[PDB]
Structure 1
């Protein structure tokens, strides 16, 4: 069996165990700023991602086993205007050599691709439900399951995600401690059919393709563990 875990209570400004992609950087104060901010204001057309350095072994063809994992993190999405926001932030798993894919509504994750994501989606695209939502996405920008999400501007959101290999159940929840409000969604997801044996895990985010649809996507901490047995 092979267990792997890590925790950051904040991020190091030059983080060698984190692969930063696109616009992503860590601030002096240790926030993982996925999308660009200039003079303290979020900018449009931005895409950033961050992956943990070590690959994770999520299934093994030889032994026919699948990993179980769990992760928590908290994040903030702040927009200068509440009524126009885009595009969102996601936690994801993809092949180890994964690179940024399409910006805007594609969240840096998908395009016209093996990636499973839990998305916190702030803009209704042609493929989306009408309301902001938390979605579970398997190799598509279209979610197989979602829950309507009452996004709170600038408030810290706490997230817990777990995957139980014995039942193929992926569950994601979000809670705003400021008003004790929570949301949850689950799905049956076969990681062996969706992903390769080894993946990297992390975050992706994009700001809108227009000046009036901008927001930040900052991650404040992160813990992860996975066991393959």
Structure 2
């Protein structure tokens, strides 16, 4: 049996009824998903915002031994008043349908220091204790510490085009980022067992936090988004 879901937005409607907005997240009158707070054109500290697609996604099925393959593309911008003081980052993620925002700052709204099923591809702009020294793209499986990462030449206020795919038959999760402005790209892949990492139905979407001090502030804006998932026989 086959179950396929697809969606695509070239720009978000300012009152998006098929997106669950959490924390500080909102859609601007020009159709930008602004995950973290912006006040008089400036990003604010201690901000956390997430946004999930309304329909839960069937990513595996015990009854029938199927596991989903999926892919997603999106464009985002992280713009910082000071390039030397960037925090904390933006992620694409999958979590249980009732998922709520979790700790702020370096925990990216995804994880906490207290409990969590979430798989995430993170675009981390600040080196915490569990991080490598550089900014990086990471693949995260039920932990804020990445299972694998690649160093990331972040370009302030430039559009980044991301493509993420999961191939169920090989358990391979791949994440790429490209800046058309200078045609530079980064990629990372990992072997991930979605089936032991997540429940059978998840919601998908984005999460981002700005830094916990006034001077570590940046935007996390998502400009568009496509997603497709197929759950079918092995």
The answer to whether TM tops 0.5 is yes
Q: Could you say what secondary structure the match of 1:221 adopts?
A: strand
Return the offset for 1:126.
0.5
Give the alignment of 1:50-89 within 5 angstroms. Answer: 50-89=51-90
Return the offset for 1:22.
0.1
| Offset from partner CA, 1:208-227 (integer Å, 9 cap, x none) | 00011000000000000000
Give the alignment of 1:131-210 within 5 angstroms. Answer: 131-210=134-213
Structure 2 distance, partners of 1:36, 1:111, is 21
| Offset from partner CA, 1:102-126 (integer Å, 9 cap, x none) | 0000000001100000000000001
Structure 2 distance, partners of 1:107, 1:64, is 33
Q: Could you say what secondary structure the match of 2:16 adopts?
A: coil
Q: Could you say what secondary structure the match of 2:55 adopts?
A: coil
Return the offset for 1:172.
0.2
Structure 2 spans left out of the alignment, 5+ residues? none
Q: Could you say what secondary structure the match of 1:193 adopts?
A: helix
Return the offset for 1:145.
0.2
| Offset from partner CA, 1:38-62 (integer Å, 9 cap, x none) | 0010000000000000000000011
Structure 1 distance, partners of 2:163, 2:153, is 17
* TM-score, normalising length: structure 2: 0.98
Give the alignment of 1:26-41 within 5 angstroms. Answer: 26-41=27-42
**Number of equivalent positions:** 229
Return the offset for 1:206.
0.1
Return the offset for 1:159.
0.2
| Offset from partner CA, 1:186-208 (integer Å, 9 cap, x none) | 00000010000000000000000
Structure 1 distance, partners of 2:112, 2:103, is 5
Return the offset for 1:18.
0.1
Structure 2 distance, partners of 1:3, 1:192, is 18
Structure 2 distance, partners of 1:161, 1:6, is 15
Q: CA RMSD in A?
A: 0.3
Structure 2 distance, partners of 1:203, 1:32, is 10
Structure 1 spans left out of the alignment, 5+ residues? none
Return the offset for 1:35.
0.1
Return the offset for 1:95.
0.1
Return the offset for 1:157.
0.1
| Offset from partner CA, 1:12-33 (integer Å, 9 cap, x none) | 0000000000000000000000
* TM-score, normalising length: structure 1: 1.00
Q: Could you say what secondary structure the match of 1:109 adopts?
A: coil
| Offset from partner CA, 1:145-180 (integer Å, 9 cap, x none) | 000000000000000000000000000000000000
